Design an enzyme around this catalytic site. Structure first.
Site, PDB file in Angstrom:
ATOM      1  N   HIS A  41       0.810  -1.212   0.000  1.00 17.16           N
ATOM      2  CA  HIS A  41       0.000   0.000   0.000  1.00 17.16           C
ATOM      3  C   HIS A  41       0.846   1.266   0.000  1.00 17.16           C
ATOM      4  O   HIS A  41       0.298   2.354  -0.208  1.00 17.16           O
ATOM      5  CB  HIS A  41      -0.948   0.009   1.205  1.00 17.16           C
ATOM      6  N   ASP A  88       0.240  -7.323   2.608  1.00 15.47           N
ATOM      7  CA  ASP A  88       0.669  -5.939   2.409  1.00 15.47           C
ATOM      8  C   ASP A  88       2.196  -5.899   2.340  1.00 15.47           C
ATOM      9  O   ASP A  88       2.889  -5.386   3.222  1.00 15.47           O
ATOM     10  CB  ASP A  88       0.136  -5.047   3.520  1.00 15.47           C
ATOM     11  N   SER A 173       4.669   3.238   7.697  1.00 15.47           N
ATOM     12  CA  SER A 173       4.286   2.123   6.844  1.00 15.47           C
ATOM     13  C   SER A 173       5.472   1.670   6.003  1.00 15.47           C
ATOM     14  O   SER A 173       6.274   2.485   5.539  1.00 15.47           O
ATOM     15  CB  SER A 173       3.122   2.530   5.939  1.00 15.47           C
ATOM     16  N   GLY A 174       5.583   0.357   5.819  1.00 17.66           N
ATOM     17  CA  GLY A 174       6.697  -0.219   5.103  1.00 17.66           C
ATOM     18  C   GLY A 174       7.964  -0.375   5.911  1.00 17.66           C
ATOM     19  O   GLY A 174       8.889  -1.058   5.453  1.00 17.66           O
TER      20      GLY A 174
END
Ligand SMILES: *[C@@H]1O[C@H](CO[C@@H]2O[C@@H](C)[C@@H](O)[C@@H](O)[C@@H]2O)[C@@H](O[C@@H]2O[C@H](CO)[C@@H](O)[C@H](O)[C@H]2NC(C)=O)[C@H](O)[C@H]1NC(C)=O
Ligand SMILES: *[C@@H]1O[C@H](CO[C@@H]2O[C@@H](C)[C@@H](O)[C@@H](O)[C@@H]2O)[C@@H](O[C@@H]2O[C@H](CO)[C@@H](O)[C@H](O)[C@H]2NC(C)=O)[C@H](O)[C@H]1NC(C)=O
Ligand SMILES: [Br-]
Ligand SMILES: [Br-]
Length: 218
Positions: A41, A88, A173-174
């Site tokens: 995402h 994800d 995120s990530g």
């Protein structure tokens, strides 16, 4: 990172910053000289051709000569579910190979299927928001967290800071989750806002994709 601390410069040479026009928007992990690992995402609904992969960074507010910048050459996704945030994970091949040194190094992944039990101590990190309208973090932040299995799906690795409100947030995120020196998680999503103190933080389970990862990075 909400409620964490400043990391020691280049303490995590595998830590990567994904940037658009000089602005950090997600984290990532160097899993090979020419491959990074992040959340699917993080590159969804963005212009990947404009994404810059910045290695060996610590303080994003300064122009640091320790940096090595790369672009995305190839995208690999294995069933990313954008509605349920399942799988994800995305493997991004770089337009070149990183020079390995004190500040840029490849991370170690766990074995396929290795699952972390409740209570395991891990370390989160990222350049995400600092919390209550505090803004983005310039220097890399880290946070001691504890793995929890309650209020968590089997398709995620979840963590929770005991006794106080802290955790990952927008911009993290990530980013990797480090447990026993291995990258076991990719920051995926939060519930009840950041540092809710009630809902664990959810990470994509790196262990469930090691074979797939290995098949790509040889
Ligand atoms: C690999 O790619 C980097 C990144 O290029 C920048 O980022 C992309 C998203 C896109 O905007 C490209 O047009 C950009 O070049 C390359 O980095 C550049 O190198 C040139 C020449 O050495 C330098 O003038 C720029 O400042 C660099 N850009 C940076 C640091 O953002 C890099 O050269 C590429 N490597 C190979 C082997 O192709
Ligand atoms: C807070 O976390 C640090 C770091 O966690 C360790 O290292 C991470 C990279 C990851 O692999 C985690 O799973 C690990 O737990 C803890 O640091 C270790 O602490 C011990 C003493 O308790 C020390 O001997 C090690 O050298 C430390 N490792 C480091 C600094 O990399 C630290 O203990 C945690 N503190 C609390 C209060 O939970
Ligand atoms: Br802390
Ligand atoms: Br900061």
């Amino acid at each position: 990172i909400v409620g964490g601390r400043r990391a020691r410069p280049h303490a995590w040479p595998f830590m990567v910053s994904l940037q658009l026009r000089g602005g950090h928007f997600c984290g990532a992990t160097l899993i090979a000289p020419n491959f990074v690992m992040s959340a699917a995402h993080c590159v969804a609904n963005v212009n990947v051709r404009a994404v810059r992969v910045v290695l060996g960074a610590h303080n994003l507010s300064r122009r640091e000569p320790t940096r090595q910048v790369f672009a995305v050459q190839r995208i690999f996704e294995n069933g990313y579910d954008p509605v349920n945030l399942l799988n994800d994970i995305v493997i991004l091949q770089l337009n070149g190979s990183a020079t390995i040194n004190a500040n840029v190094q490849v991370a170690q992944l766990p074995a396929q299927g290795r699952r972390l039990g409740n209570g395991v101590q891990c370390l989160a990190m990222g350049w995400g928001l600092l919390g209550r309208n505090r803004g983005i973090a310039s220097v890399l932040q880290e946070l001691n967290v504890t793995v929890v299995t309650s209020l968590c799906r089997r398709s995620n690795v979840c963590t929770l800071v005991r006794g106080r409100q802290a955790g990952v947030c927008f911009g993290d995120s990530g980013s990797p989750l480090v447990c026993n020196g291995l990258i076991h998680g990719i920051a995926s999503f939060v519930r009840g806002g950041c540092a809710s103190g009630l809902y664990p933080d959810a990470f994509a389970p790196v262990a469930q994709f090691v074979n797939w990862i290995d098949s790509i990075i040889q």
